[PDB]
Structure formats: C-alpha cells, structure tokens
Nucleic acid binder design. Structure first.
Ligand SMILES: [Mn+2]
Ligand SMILES: [Mn+2]
Length: 116
DNA sequence: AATATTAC
C-alpha cells in the first residue's frame, strides 16, 4: 500500500529521455489540483533519467503510484514511470539535480519557494 | 508502486 502525502515532490524517471520542457508542461497539468508553485525538470544524459522537483500550494495526497506516468507522443509511445517521493529538503533536492546538469537540459517554471 | 539500480 503506497501513499505520498506532501506539498513537495521529488520525481525520478529512469531510462527516460523526455525533453525536460514537455515533461514539465504535462506534469504541471497533471498536478494542477495542488496548484504547483515551482517546478524544476532536469534531464541527465550520461543511465539516462529525469529528475523533477515540484513545490505545490497544497499537500498533494497521491495513492495511485501510476498517477504521474508519462507517455511519449511518437514511436514507440512508451509509458515512463516515476519514483515518487516526498522531498525532505527542497534546497538539497534542487541543488542535487541542477548540479547533475549543460543548461539545455533544464526546465524551470514559477518562483522557487523558500521552505521553512 | 514500480520504473530501475535512478532516486535529497
Ligand atoms: Mn540523477
Ligand atoms: Mn537515495
């Protein structure tokens, strides 16, 4: 039985290559009930993988482990599944994934929130 | 969970 109940989410999509911008744009509508405040999306192309950090205005309660899955819009139309965690420190997470980044592979939206 | 071994 899986439950993530948090305002702040650290997503990881292994073996995933989605352009960070489209991952950001569609995760923003998937999460729109929780009013996303800030989103950062970083593709790492050295095990190719996505990291996403999401700061919402309301505590998101996620109980469907597939609710955030993403599908390519071209062949082979693969489902991409994330590790979904509550972020223990948004500053540490942000630091981790932006350090992992070229600035071509990054996508931000909104104003970063200074958690307390 | 459920990608996968990536994930503060
Ligand atoms: Mn990484
Ligand atoms: Mn870890």
């Amino acid at each position: 039985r899986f439950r993530v109940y948090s305002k702040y989410l650290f997503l990881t999509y292994p073996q995933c290559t989605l352009e960070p911008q489209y991952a950001l744009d569609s995760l923003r509508t998937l999460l729109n009930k929780y009013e996303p405040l800030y989103i950062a999306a970083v593709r790492e192309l050295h095990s190719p993988h996505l990291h996403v950090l999401v700061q919402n205005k309301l505590r998101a309660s996620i109980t469907n482990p597939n609710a955030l899955n993403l599908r390519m819009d071209t062949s082979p139309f693969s489902i991409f599944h994330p590790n979904i965690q509550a972020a223990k420190d948004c500053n540490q997470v942000r630091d981790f994934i932006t350090k992992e980044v070229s600035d071509v592979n990054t996508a931000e939206w909104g104003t970063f929130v200074a958690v307390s």
